[PDB]
Amino acid sequence: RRYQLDVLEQAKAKNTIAFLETGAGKTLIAILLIKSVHKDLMSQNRKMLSVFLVPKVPLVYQQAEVIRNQTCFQVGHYCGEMGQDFWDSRRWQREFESKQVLVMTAQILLNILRHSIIRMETIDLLILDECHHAVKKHPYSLVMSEFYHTTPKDKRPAIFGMTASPVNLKGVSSQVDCAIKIRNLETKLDSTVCTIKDRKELEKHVPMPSEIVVEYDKAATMWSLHETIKQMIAAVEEAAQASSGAANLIHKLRAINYTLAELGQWCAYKVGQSFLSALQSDERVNFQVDVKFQESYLSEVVSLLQCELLEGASLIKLLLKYQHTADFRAIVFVERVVAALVLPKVFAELPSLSFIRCASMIGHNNSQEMKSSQMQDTISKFRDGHVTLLVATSVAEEGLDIRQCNVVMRFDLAKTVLAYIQSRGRARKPGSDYILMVERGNVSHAAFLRNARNSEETLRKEAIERTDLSHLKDTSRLISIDAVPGTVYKVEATGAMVSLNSAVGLVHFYCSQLPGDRYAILRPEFSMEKHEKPGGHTEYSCRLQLPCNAPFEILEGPVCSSMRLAQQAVCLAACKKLHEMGAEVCESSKLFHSEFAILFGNELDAEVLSMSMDLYVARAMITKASLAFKGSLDITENQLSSLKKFHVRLMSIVLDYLFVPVTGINWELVEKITKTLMMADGCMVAEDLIGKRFYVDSICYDMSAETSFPRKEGYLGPLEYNTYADYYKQKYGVDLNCKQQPLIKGRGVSYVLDKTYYVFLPPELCVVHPLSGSLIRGAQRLPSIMRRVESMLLAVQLKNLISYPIPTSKILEALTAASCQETFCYERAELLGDAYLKWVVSRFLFLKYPQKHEGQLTRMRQQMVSNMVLYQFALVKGLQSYRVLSSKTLADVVEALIGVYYVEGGKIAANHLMKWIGIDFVGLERALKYEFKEKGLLVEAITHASRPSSGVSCYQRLEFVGDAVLDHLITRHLFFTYTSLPPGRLTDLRAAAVNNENFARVAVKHKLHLYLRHGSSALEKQIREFVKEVQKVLGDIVESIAGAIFLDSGKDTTAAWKVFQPLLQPMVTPETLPMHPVRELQERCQQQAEGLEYKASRSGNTATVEVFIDGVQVGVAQNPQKKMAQKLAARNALAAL
RNA sequence: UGAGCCAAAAGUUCAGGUGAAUGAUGCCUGGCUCGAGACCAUUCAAUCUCAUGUAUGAGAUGUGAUGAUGUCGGACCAGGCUUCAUUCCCCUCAACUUUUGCCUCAAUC
């Protein structure tokens, strides 16, 4: 419309309020405004930040569906009703980059406004709706006030307005002037208001409904005597109040009384029937005996009334009037939800007309349940013709899709002036007709006439800017401007609102986030004591109750006269407290038991060298000792060059700083090696290598080319060889020149003997080698010796460590890579080191902060013990540079060094290495076997996170320190014993030893739970069930007792360990394998292993083993999800096998 | 050519931790709207005393209306905490299956 275009142009120039009924395309104008700001160039693309603010979740979905068709710029929407304040802030940051437009509820925006950016999120332009509904008490107005005053450079000069405002905020009839309250609102809005111009362009395509006066009800109530019975029902409700869920049942009796007076007893019978269905559901909902007795009492009273009401059993004429032509589009409204619920039942009994109703989303007394999504489904169903023909009644009159509705009749609903205008707007083009019924029973006439006249006169007068201010000057200011001045203008008001909102959010989040012992804990409570003073003002003092976890949070404030204001002042002080909480080469000869001598410039160190080193050879065990018998020995350069040439022929050629065998260096042998029909000679072949290279023990005259060669395999049917020479001719296409030539004995330089004996190689065919066979055997072992020498050099580097208590031979074992299994594995040392590191980190955290939350302390422990952080320390160490793929466990090597150091030296020395790189009660004492010097530490362990309205201390801090110390103490005992278990199996055994369930078993054995005091009844029931089971809370209390013992013992590991050692001593001796039966069945046969699916979300009724060959067996347990039932079936399978 | 074994990889079945998502919720809080109240603001109408030394002022008292606050019930609505069920993620773990790496065997080099 032309008027709508004028408001759109004005809205771009400055913030403007547009007056319309039922939108009438105002939403389209708002979409055009969003497109208009998007099209123009902006300094920052996201600076415009057009946003639509609507509190209702269904309205957000309806706005989103229209937004998708247009709004080409990316859009984001919030479902709402989710308790994730941190997630919402993270989503907002991600949304700001990803989407230009955001849609949010007003209350969620208030959460974003708390701790807002200096530019207040750079919103610049936002869309505001329901301003008329909003009042100074209402939260939406408080959200508007923060926008109304802009801290930086007029951050939000123009605000889009979707607030049509049907008449005024409220009380149009009370004000003689058209809108004194609206004038106060406009100053708070800081927005120009456009003239309504109702007939200038509007109503050209919009119909106007006409009010019709009708009788209040069809016919009249026929039960005057039953009204006296209704008074008796009220007396019965008063008796229920005297007797002292019961209140809700009393409300049901009140609802029956209201319905029977308004629509007669026949309607009341229908409400009683609906209450009877509600009674059955509420009886299932609440099992309390007192509530059930009240429900049964109510059911008997209504049932006695129902029989007479059934013998006895709205606006039927109106339904008949619109019945003609089968009109589908109609809307009806009712005073109460119960009347709407029973309206189809009333229609079915006598009119025989199908009817449906829309229940309010919020449910009172749980008579009927409406989901927000279900309400959206109901409006979508209403669009379908069949549902529209039935027609729907909603008291709320909100989020309903109704179009072309000839009848907009409203029943007993003159309470809201804006809603009356909204219903007039709702009625559409066909047969437009507003229906209002005067009531014969009560005087409903004068009030309605006055309200209608006042509303029309006020709209006409307001069709001019500042009409009220022009008409009255001082008087208008005194009546309204003085009564309702703009708020948040001063700095203090903004500070206080931000503080109250922040207080509520912070207290809820922190309390729920820490212990989490119970689903609901009343950690925060308020108690009020009257402080009324003589003076006609009355005052209240609000006590605040907080848990032992928050020591200074408790505060009492009686300064504010109002009880609510006094509570707000206490909350403001608590919020500030929450903010504070937030805040020339030596010759070396190796002797093996001719010896090989290695020339090394560095003198050998006796401590690094090992007197005895084992040789991994099956034939014999050899011990090798290396020492430098000369220092800085000088060898001639010509001799050195010959040695190098001899060494490469001796080693590099055979393999395909300088090592020379010494008998006195064998110079003559070195020279020969540097240089490197026939009849076999025994002296020549006594020691030589033959290359077609193999050692020759001797030449066998009996073996000859003439002698026949046997065929080892007949499976392939190879031709049998008449002569050994015939085999050579087949194998190599060669014939030996001499038939009687002796044949070299078969030997293998490579790592069996019978295969070498089977094949004999001719001396003429294979050339002899000067090098002796025994020297070649030493040369074969020489590369392994060289690898050992490299490890010894690495050991010299280990001695270079700044502090080492003894020669670090154990560190050399740690250096070798895990899983190579060449000699030794450091995994066992790594486990001890990891436990030591965890205990030290926990002790440091307790020192850094004594009162720090246990959950925060656990997070601090995790980051300190993280493998990646240790890996970074290893990178500075240069451990990777002893081909590293970056997935190598350098951190595990660091843990192994800590474990090796703990065995090598005292804990203080190990801590220094960590600095270098890593940086009734008497009866309880008898059962504990530990006497407590301080009673308070024992009391702290006895105190639990769950408390019966009294909190002394937090056991969480003790449990965290206790758990870490216990893990280290248990590992030390296992490590001290030489179990020699496989390292992976040892890790599983260590994990089994540190089990919360085993600690829980210890707690029941010592009756620790009985000594412990907790406020959770259900937790005690779980403890008693565990006692029945044995013939993690209990484990945590044992850790808390251990932490208290540690504080009592001055943090001495040995004293705490002596107390804890006896209980787990029986458990360690049995294997206690954690492999499990089902996993053992998989080890036996996983080739065809099938596992039965659990039946339903709840525990499956039976668990069966589907694995083949073992067969199908049934196991019974509390749940098959843990697979304990499957484990029992696997044990049955083992019995079957 | 097989068979075992020994390491790895890719899968698969686990004991577990680890987060996320979607449901089922549960709990709590704020306000809206209307009636009753009670007490404060103002004061007609009527009354009531004092003056001027007829006409009128001190003016009061107060019927009534409005404007606030504090209660008690109706009709509404939006958030915040929050848990289990399922799925998935990641990290170990008990393995298993195949290939490789790589010991054997002996034709066999």
Side-chain angles (χ1 to χ4, degrees), chain A residues 1082-1103:
Chain A
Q1082 293 166 189
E1083 300 170 9
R1084 185 198 65 94
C1085 275
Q1086 204 177 324
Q1087 312 94 24
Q1088 295 294 328
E1090 294 81 22
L1092 174 94
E1093 302 292 336
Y1094 326 123
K1095 286 109 181 187
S1097 61
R1098 50 171 167 266
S1099 150
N1101 300 346
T1102 167

Side-chain angles (χ1 to χ4, degrees), chain A residues 85 167 212 252 348 364 484 535 596 637 650 658 673 862 961 1037 1102:
Chain A
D85 61 330
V167 262
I212 306 290
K252 285 181 175 181
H364 322 92
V484 196
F596 289 83
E637 68 286 332
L650 170 78
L658 194 50
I673 305 315
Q862 295 163 8
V961 295
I1037 81 182
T1102 167

Side-chain angles (χ1 to χ4, degrees), chain A residues 497-564:
Chain A
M497 200 57 214
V498 168
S499 305
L500 182 67
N501 297 332
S502 301
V504 175
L506 289 173
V507 300
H508 279 81
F509 118 78
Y510 134 81
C511 148
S512 40
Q513 166 237 9
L514 233 285
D517 218 357
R518 183 97 303 185
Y519 191 94
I521 324 180
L522 203 51
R523 289 171 61 184
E525 173 63 23
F526 26 84
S527 185
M528 277 69 63
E529 205 273 324
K530 199 166 184 56
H531 263 226
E532 173 183 13
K533 14 100 32 114
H537 208 15
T538 167
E539 211 173 33
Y540 258 93
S541 64
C542 296
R543 283 75 59 91
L544 209 59
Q545 317 297 139
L546 269 324
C548 49
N549 203 10
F552 53 89
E553 259 66 28
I554 290 172
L555 183 127
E556 283 76 30
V559 282
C560 302
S561 163
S562 175
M563 184 179 63
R564 286 177 290 266

Side-chain angles (χ1 to χ4, degrees), chain A residues 688-890:
Chain A
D688 62 325
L689 273 84
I690 43 109
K692 315 166 62 176
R693 287 265 187 181
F694 286 140
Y695 315 126
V696 184
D697 306 344
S698 184
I699 36 118
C700 304
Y701 188 75
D702 54 285
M703 290 290 174
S704 289
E706 188 179 355
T707 69
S708 180
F709 194 90
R711 234 304 92 191
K712 108 94 195 176
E713 178 179 11
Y715 303 101
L716 253 296
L719 184 66
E720 278 69 34
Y721 319 99
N722 46 75
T723 60
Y724 256 68
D726 186 28
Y727 172 69
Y728 305 145
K729 199 64 187 179
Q730 168 258 359
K731 206 61 211 315
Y732 319 106
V734 62
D735 186 55
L736 186 49
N737 41 20
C738 187
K739 295 308 168 180
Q740 51 97 15
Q741 172 85 184
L743 290 180
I744 277 163
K745 183 62 176 174
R747 267 290 305 179
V749 175
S750 62
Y751 312 97
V752 279
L753 284 175
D754 55 8
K755 153 177 56 179
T756 80
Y757 299 156
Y758 174 81
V759 280
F760 264 40
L761 284 173
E764 179 259 343
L765 285 192
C766 311
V767 284
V768 307
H769 203 262
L771 241 162
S772 66
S774 57
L775 225 45
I776 294 288
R777 292 162 59 257
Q780 181 72 219
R781 301 145 190 171
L782 199 127
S784 70
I785 294 176
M786 290 179 62
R787 304 293 78 88
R788 185 83 283 180
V789 166
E790 299 298 332
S791 91
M792 307 318 268
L793 181 66
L794 252 304
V796 181
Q797 272 92 71
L798 295 174
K799 318 301 180 192
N800 299 347
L801 187 60
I802 315 297
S803 56
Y804 69 115
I806 60 173
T808 55
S809 60
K810 310 171 196 177
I811 293 208
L812 154 99
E813 106 99 351
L815 120 93
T816 65
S819 298
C820 283
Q821 304 306 126
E822 309 294 331
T823 163
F824 29 55
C825 59
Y826 66 90
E827 321 178 16
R828 298 176 55 98
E830 165 255 349
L831 297 168
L832 184 53
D834 201 12
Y836 187 89
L837 162 85
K838 182 171 178 291
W839 159 70
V840 164
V841 159
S842 66
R843 183 67 198 95
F844 282 174
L845 298 176
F846 191 64
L847 284 162
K848 298 310 165 299
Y849 334 95
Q851 314 297 324
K852 187 57 75 72
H853 295 269
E854 163 256 345
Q856 178 62 41
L857 281 175
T858 309
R859 294 302 153 179
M860 294 288 292
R861 185 176 59 184
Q862 295 163 8
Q863 53 94 7
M864 290 298 297
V865 303
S866 284
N867 61 330
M868 306 305 177
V869 187
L870 304 173
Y871 174 80
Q872 301 298 130
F873 295 135
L875 294 177
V876 337
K877 284 304 290 297
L879 289 183
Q880 71 286 347
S881 50
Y882 277 131
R883 296 291 89 93
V884 48
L885 29 135
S886 94
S887 304
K888 291 187 176 176
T889 55
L890 262 63

Side-chain angles (χ1 to χ4, degrees), chain A residues 19 119 124 221 223 236 277 511 715 918:
Chain A
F19 268 68
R119 310 218 59 92
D124 189 40
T221 69
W223 299 272
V236 163
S277 71
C511 148
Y715 303 101

Side-chain angles (χ1 to χ4, degrees), chain A residues 39-313:
Chain A
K39 78 177 89 292
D40 58 68
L41 195 56
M42 287 282 295
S43 58
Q44 174 189 337
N45 183 32
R46 296 305 145 96
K47 180 59 76 178
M48 8 173 174
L49 233 212
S50 54
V51 154
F52 197 119
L53 191 67
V54 39
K56 318 293 172 60
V57 22
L59 281 191
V60 164
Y61 296 148
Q62 296 290 317
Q63 183 263 357
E65 87 199 21
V66 314
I67 243 202
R68 293 305 298 113
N69 179 44
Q70 319 97 195
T71 337
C72 50
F73 273 77
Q74 324 95 352
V75 285
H77 320 285
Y78 273 104
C79 170
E81 69 263 355
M82 297 168 298
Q84 26 83 66
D85 61 330
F86 309 114
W87 267 91
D88 274 344
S89 68
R90 260 99 53 90
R91 286 169 191 182
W92 139 256
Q93 303 153 6
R94 288 172 284 182
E95 178 276 334
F96 186 70
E97 311 138 358
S98 67
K99 306 142 181 185
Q100 170 82 234
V101 184
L102 182 51
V103 177
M104 202 186 314
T105 103
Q107 296 210 25
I108 305 194
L109 184 62
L110 190 54
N111 314 334
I112 316 292
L113 289 183
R114 305 152 197 180
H115 304 94
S116 189
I117 328 286
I118 52 179
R119 310 218 59 92
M120 289 191 58
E121 303 123 13
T122 75
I123 304 208
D124 189 40
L125 312 145
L126 62 116
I127 303 195
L128 208 75
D129 67 350
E130 310 171 6
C131 194
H132 43 278
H133 297 123
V135 296
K136 48 171 182 302
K137 286 185 59 184
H138 198 288
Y140 217 144
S141 76
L142 306 173
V143 176
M144 178 192 61
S145 74
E146 285 124 5
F147 292 113
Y148 129 86
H149 180 266
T150 139
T151 309
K153 317 182 327 164
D154 286 357
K155 196 53 204 60
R156 286 90 53 195
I159 301 302
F160 305 129
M162 259 306 297
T163 158
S165 181
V167 262
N168 72 328
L169 300 161
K170 218 47 202 64
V172 47
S173 308
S174 174
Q175 313 153 8
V176 285
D177 29 34
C178 36
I180 27 173
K181 293 311 172 65
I182 285 295
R183 262 65 190 178
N184 311 338
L185 180 76
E186 298 300 337
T187 69
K188 298 181 300 180
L189 268 169
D190 272 356
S191 307
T192 63
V193 41
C194 194
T195 157
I196 308 191
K197 299 226 278 299
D198 56 298
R199 211 48 199 90
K200 137 84 172 50
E201 218 67 32
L202 317 167
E203 280 259 343
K204 287 186 318 175
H205 321 102
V206 160
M208 24 95 56
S210 57
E211 187 270 336
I212 306 290
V213 184
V214 190
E215 192 70 27
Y216 70 112
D217 187 16
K218 177 64 192 60
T221 69
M222 299 106 68
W223 299 272
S224 176
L225 261 309
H226 271 82
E227 303 290 330
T228 318
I229 307 181
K230 146 193 177 180
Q231 312 302 130
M232 307 309 177
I233 300 174
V236 163
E237 117 196 6
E238 295 159 8
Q241 298 163 3
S243 81
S244 302
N248 297 352
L249 307 174
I250 285 160
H251 304 147
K252 285 181 175 181
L253 291 181
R254 296 168 46 180
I256 298 174
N257 297 345
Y258 305 145
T259 54
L260 71 94
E262 74 178 4
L263 243 159
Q265 284 291 4
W266 82 85
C267 181
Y269 171 76
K270 306 298 169 55
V271 325
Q273 202 67 35
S274 74
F275 288 148
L276 240 300
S277 71
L279 270 165
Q280 305 310 308
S281 63
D282 66 44
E283 284 158 356
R284 302 153 194 170
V285 156
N286 219 1
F287 292 113
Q288 303 184 20
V289 44
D290 301 357
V291 182
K292 279 189 169 303
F293 142 77
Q294 290 283 347
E295 288 157 343
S296 68
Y297 178 84
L298 190 89
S299 74
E300 60 103 357
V301 181
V302 56
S303 69
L304 183 60
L305 250 295
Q306 274 175 336
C307 62
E308 55 246 17
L309 296 200
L310 181 53
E311 300 160 7

Side-chain angles (χ1 to χ4, degrees), chain A residues 437-608:
Chain A
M437 298 79 58
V438 285
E439 312 287 306
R440 174 209 53 88
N442 75 287
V443 45
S444 66
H445 207 34
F448 132 78
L449 294 166
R450 289 175 295 180
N451 183 28
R453 250 43 63 187
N454 291 318
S455 305
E456 272 75 274
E457 249 64 35
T458 63
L459 296 166
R460 303 292 74 86
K461 300 164 188 175
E462 78 197 33
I464 316 181
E465 282 68 40
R466 255 179 42 99
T467 356
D468 216 319
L469 293 194
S470 63
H471 296 155
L472 304 167
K473 230 59 186 179
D474 58 318
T475 135
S476 70
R477 291 186 291 264
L478 293 167
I479 199 64
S480 269
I481 300 288
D482 295 3
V484 196
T487 62
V488 111
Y489 64 105
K490 27 185 302 293
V491 186
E492 196 268 342
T494 107
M497 200 57 214
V498 168
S499 305
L500 182 67
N501 297 332
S502 301
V504 175
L506 289 173
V507 300
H508 279 81
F509 118 78
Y510 134 81
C511 148
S512 40
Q513 166 237 9
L514 233 285
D517 218 357
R518 183 97 303 185
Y519 191 94
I521 324 180
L522 203 51
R523 289 171 61 184
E525 173 63 23
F526 26 84
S527 185
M528 277 69 63
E529 205 273 324
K530 199 166 184 56
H531 263 226
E532 173 183 13
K533 14 100 32 114
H537 208 15
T538 167
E539 211 173 33
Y540 258 93
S541 64
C542 296
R543 283 75 59 91
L544 209 59
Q545 317 297 139
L546 269 324
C548 49
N549 203 10
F552 53 89
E553 259 66 28
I554 290 172
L555 183 127
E556 283 76 30
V559 282
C560 302
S561 163
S562 175
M563 184 179 63
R564 286 177 290 266
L565 285 183
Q567 181 64 38
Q568 157 184 349
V570 182
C571 292
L572 284 166
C575 189
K576 305 307 178 307
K577 293 175 176 182
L578 252 313
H579 289 319
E580 299 162 0
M581 303 213 74
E584 302 294 332
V585 269
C586 323
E587 67 95 5
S588 307
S589 181
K590 180 171 267 301
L591 313 167
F592 325 106
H593 318 282
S594 62
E595 261 67 26
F596 289 83
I598 174 180
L599 295 165
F600 214 85
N602 180 38
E603 177 77 12
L604 281 192
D605 196 2
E607 56 115 356
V608 320

